[PDB]
Write a protein that binds this ligand. Structure first.
Ligand code: I39
Length: 344
């Protein structure tokens, strides 16, 4: 039951995949392919140098554990994972397979004000996957239009959840990479939690409604100023919670500003959209609406269905606090590769 693999050069590299996968074409490097066993269009990712350091070995493991866990319509999961290796000692490459969606939320929306129902449907799907992700005590933490995979039927899957990898230069300047980040994680105010993802959803939703980036900061400080101008400066209760004395000290230097009226910012928008944005874009993370609570909000009355909004089984991330050697991460990775059961 080891399938027959065939070799092929794509993306300056030798892809060796089971015969079931045909018509590979570039799109880790990623190829679109046709899965002859399932009839599905699939995306196949070949990891580069998954075991070159302790840090990458753990990342590879992390990515696989994460992708193996997610079984939800609005979250990218695994149809397949394989390696051409026949044993651990020759194990070297990992290939991950999921549904081909073919575009991201930008390749559809950037500089476009969309209809209220399209916004309803896209945001409902994001919140629906987020409830599922968050129920597993997993934090996406870098949610943004380019991490939302979307096909022609406006069906949406969340990508790249749970990886905490972005370098400082990637976050610097007038860059999309920081514009959807919650202030408390942007400026490292505190050991953050899952409510940071709801901040990102509000940023995305606002942009779908107006056709414009909500907080297009030119640097971290410019972006903070844009945020506080909309949502107000921190009150006393929130200040305490900023465990970062340096951060706290800077915020207290700022002229106090009241929260703006959202109905005058998002002129013409559905009042239920505005109301929901007000519950999403709250400075104090403790008081933000959660994914579960938002799904029950009147804005989504057309799509909401409490019997089809599943939660996840618990996700054992005890491994995150574990120090291991490269080859122990590799062995754990191999185990997960070889224990994989495909879905129905
Ligand atoms: C979002 C997107 C836009 C254009 C082309 C492909 C894709 C795309 C991917 N990059 C990916 C993708 O990056 C990916 C993630 C996990 C995995 F196991 C395998 C994968 F190929 C998945 C699906 N699609 O549709």
């Amino acid at each position: 039951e080891r399938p027959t693999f065939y070799r092929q050069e794509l993306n300056k590299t030798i892809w060796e995949v089971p015969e079931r996968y045909q018509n590979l074409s570039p799109v880790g490097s990623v190829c679109a392919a046709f899965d002859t066993k399932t009839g599905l269009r699939v995306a196949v990712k070949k990891l580069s140098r998954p075991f070159q350091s302790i840090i990458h070995a753990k990342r590879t493991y992390r990515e696989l554990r994460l992708l193996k866990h997610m079984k939800h319509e609005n979250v990218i999961g695994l149809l397949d994972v394989f390696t051409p290796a026949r044993s651990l000692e020759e194990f070297n490459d990992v290939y991950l397979v999921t549904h081909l969606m073919g575009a991201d939320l930008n390749n559809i929306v950037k500089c476009q004000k969309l209809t209220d129902d399209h916004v309803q449907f896209l945001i409902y799907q994001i919140l629906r996957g987020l409830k599922y992700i968050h129920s597993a005590d997993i934090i996406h933490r870098d949610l943004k239009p380019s991490n939302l995979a979307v096909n022609e039927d406006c069906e949406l899957k969340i990508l790249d959840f749970g990886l905490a990898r972005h370098t400082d230069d990637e976050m610097t300047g007038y860059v999309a990479t920081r514009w959807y980040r919650a202030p408390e994680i942007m400026l490292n105010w505190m050991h953050y939690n899952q409510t940071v993802d709801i901040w990102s959803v509000g940023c995305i939703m606002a942009e779908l409604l107006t056709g414009r980036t909500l907080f297009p900061g030119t640097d971290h400080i410019d972006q903070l100023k844009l945020i506080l101008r909309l949502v107000g400066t921190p009150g006393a209760e929130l200040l305490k919670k900023i465990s970062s004395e340096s951060a706290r000290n800077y915020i207290q230097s700022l002229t106090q500003m009241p929260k703006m009226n959202f109905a005058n910012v998002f002129i013409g928008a559905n009042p239920l959209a505005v109301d929901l944005l007000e519950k999403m874009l709250v400075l104090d993370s403790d008081k933000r609406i959660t994914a579960a609570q938002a799904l029950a909000h009147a804005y989504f009355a057309q799509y909401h269905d409490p019997d089809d909004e599943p939660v996840a089984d618990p996700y054992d991330q005890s491994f995150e606090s574990r120090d291991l050697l490269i080859d122990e991460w590799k062995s754990l990775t191999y185990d997960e590769v070889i224990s994989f059961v495909p879905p129905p």
